[PDB]
Design a protein around this ligand. Structure first.
Ligand code: ASP
Ligand code: ASP
Ligand code: ASP
Ligand code: ASP
Ligand code: ASP
Ligand code: ASP
Ligand code: ASP
Ligand code: ASP
Ligand code: ASP
Ligand code: ASP
Ligand code: MG
Ligand code: MG
Lengths: 252, 252
């Protein structure tokens, strides 16, 4: 499997997940249908999204790591799949939610070869491969902001902060792309519980890095050894190379 | 002028603003075009929006209070107009932004008779009159949540908080509607600088109250004597009757 195959698979999935969710009324979407393997409830929207995705991934030699059904398959290529990221928004008709796919040649983030976040409400498509990062077919990159007085997405502000703006949209996979294309200047998830899971962030990270972002754990350690499993957890500090160290110091 | 005229006018305005913005590329939207009367830059998107609105409102015996052009007209009915709320998102292409109109029989909020917030990205329409509050022609009401462990929209969290979720979308007018239809359990703007302006909040406030929400100033003070002018600033605590007092004590 290569970055071209991945793009093809990722798009086929996006189309199906899009249809499935778009035809589903909010009263249907919001219903609890079971306990996800992640240890949180699967909403009817989650299950519908995941089924459409797994139907397609089933035909590839991959091991799938996915929120609701957990680890599936035996393949050598690993896929961190968030079938629906921002479910809470989706169940309320707030148009920030996505399907996220990160493809890796091992069970570690360092071997990623393809990242893909499709906005299910806007049809916006973000991906990155060896040729860089894209928003709807156009090369994107991160902002060149060097000042803490910038536009930040942050989970969660718990003290006074120097930022010009703070936003929290509820879809890390999508918001990481907002940072990737420069819409925002940095992305922080510094929650002490360490809540983010591999499928939430993997693609977002990969795309942000290809867009020139420096993306690291709370203390600046590499995300390379983050595992494609259900136990993995993440904090994230992501910004351009110059703003990044300033953020690291800001949160000590 | 009554509540029906208001709805008719608001819908006419919404159609024009929505068509104007949808045809406008992001690279055009984001351009600074002048300094607004509020003391912040007018973006090209702001101007296109405001001109569309004013072309329709100028045919009415109203005094208009609007972000970019300021106080206009001589009429006895006052209209707080945010021609584009969430401009930052709109320039981004992030689908949370609205046109907001609140109509009053004086220059104070207490004499409001109509509230209208239209999401320009989704086509969602929120309004309220003497018959209650609506999202897309359906009656809405606020959630009955009694616990601080709830879903909050809050500008800005500056300490540790007991909330289940925190969201900040960048359009107070729209987020006030999210609270109004119960998508969220409360809306808080507790920014010490007192940043909200009359046209950001008036319509949303009116709609929330009609949906059953209790909406006050930082100290439980009434919003009734808030002025339809450029000098007015607001903080907001908005939740149902039960949850509201708890939030009040939480933020002392
Ligand atoms: N995923 C898109 C295709 C694309 O992104 O170009 C679809 O709806 O089929
Ligand atoms: N947005 C909620 C839950 C969800 O989106 O499914 C959260 O993880 O905080
Ligand atoms: N998924 C959310 C839904 C809500 O808070 O309304 C929960 O844990 O309850
Ligand atoms: N999730 C919403 C987005 C919107 O309100 O446009 C829906 O398509 O139902
Ligand atoms: N209007 C905003 C835009 C931005 O922050 O990039 C400003 O203060 O510059
Ligand atoms: N707020 C969400 C964001 C996401 O699901 O990506 C979370 O805590 O996981
Ligand atoms: N403003 C809407 C009218 C409506 O809300 O029914 C439109 O553009 O058609
Ligand atoms: N006024 C918004 C951004 C904008 O719409 O210009 C903020 O400062 O958060
Ligand atoms: N603001 C965006 C909305 C969206 O992406 O759906 C646009 O009109 O391009
Ligand atoms: N989020 C707010 C920012 C402000 O008014 O200061 C708004 O644009 O409605
Ligand atoms: Mg779950
Ligand atoms: Mg302005």
């Amino acid at each position: 499997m290569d970055e071209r195959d991945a793009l093809r698979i990722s798009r086929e999935i996006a189309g199906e997940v899009r249809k499935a969710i778009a035809s589903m009324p909010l009263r249907e979407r919001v219903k609890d249908v079971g306990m996800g393997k992640d240890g949180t409830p699967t909403k009817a929207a989650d299950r519908v999204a995941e089924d459409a995705a797994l139907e397609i991934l089933r035909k590839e030699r991959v091991t799938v790591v996915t929120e609701e059904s957990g680890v599936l398959g035996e393949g050598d290529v690993f896929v961190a799949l968030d079938p629906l990221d921002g479910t809470f928004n989706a169940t309320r008709g707030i148009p920030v939610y996505s399907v996220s796919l990160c493809f890796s040649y091992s069970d570690k983030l360092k071997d990623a070869f393809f990242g893909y976040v499709y906005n299910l409400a806007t049809g916006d498509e973000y991906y990155a491969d060896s040729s860089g990062a894209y928003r709807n077919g156009e090369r994107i990159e991160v902002s060149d902001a060097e000042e803490l007085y910038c536009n930040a997405i942050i989970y969660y502000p718990d003290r006074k902060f120097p930022f010009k703006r703070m936003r929290i949209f509820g879809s890390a996979a999508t918001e990481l792309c907002f940072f990737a294309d420069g819409s925002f200047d940095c992305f922080l998830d510094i929650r002490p519980g360490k809540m983010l899971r591999i499928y939430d962030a993997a693609a977002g990270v990969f795309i942000a890095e290809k867009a020139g972002g420096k993306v690291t754990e709370l203390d600046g350690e590499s995300l390379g050894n983050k595992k494609f499993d259900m136990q993995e957890r993440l904090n994230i500090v992501a910004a351009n190379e110059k703003l990044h160290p300033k953020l690291l110091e800001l949160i000590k």
